[PDB]
Amino acid sequence: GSKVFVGRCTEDMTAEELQQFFCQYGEVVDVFIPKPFRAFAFVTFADDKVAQSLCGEDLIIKGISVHISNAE
Amino acid sequence: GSKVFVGRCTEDMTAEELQQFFCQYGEVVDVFIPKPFRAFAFVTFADDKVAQSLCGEDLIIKGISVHISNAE
DNA sequence: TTGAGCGTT
DNA sequence: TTGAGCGTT
DSSP, rough: EEEEEEEOOOOTTHHHHHHHHTTSSOOEEEEEEOOOOOOOEEEEOOHHHHHHTTTTEEEEEEEEEEEEEOOO | OEEEEEEOTTTOHHHHHHHHTTTTOOOOEEOOSSSSSOOOEEEEEEEEEHHHHHHHEEEETEEEEEEEEEOO
């Protein structure tokens, strides 16, 4: 389980931006942003341990609090 | 401003544990835990950028959500 | 605040 | 859910 769900994304948050933000924690291998805009994203890590360490956290991306959960 | 306040600490959270947890983000140079127990701590980073990136986040340490704020 | 497309045990 | 101690512009 190396994919996380990222809730409360804003529309200006691009895949590049999310990847740049999330790769601070470990290698990111994919980002999925729904189209049309649905205010969430999925971020996939190479390492399971990295994804699990983020679950349950609320992180600040460009001043916005996003919630991290397991991807199902 | 390279020091953060860590709110909602639990008593079992030792200085070593907090340092181990927080050094994932960057070099940690000090940890202060009040005695007697007051359910918060201060963590000092070598790098200001690291402290600022954490402010406003809620992080999970041993299953517990702690809130990160600027140290004043 | 839980996604696709290909193409079928 | 905002700390010490040393020792004084």
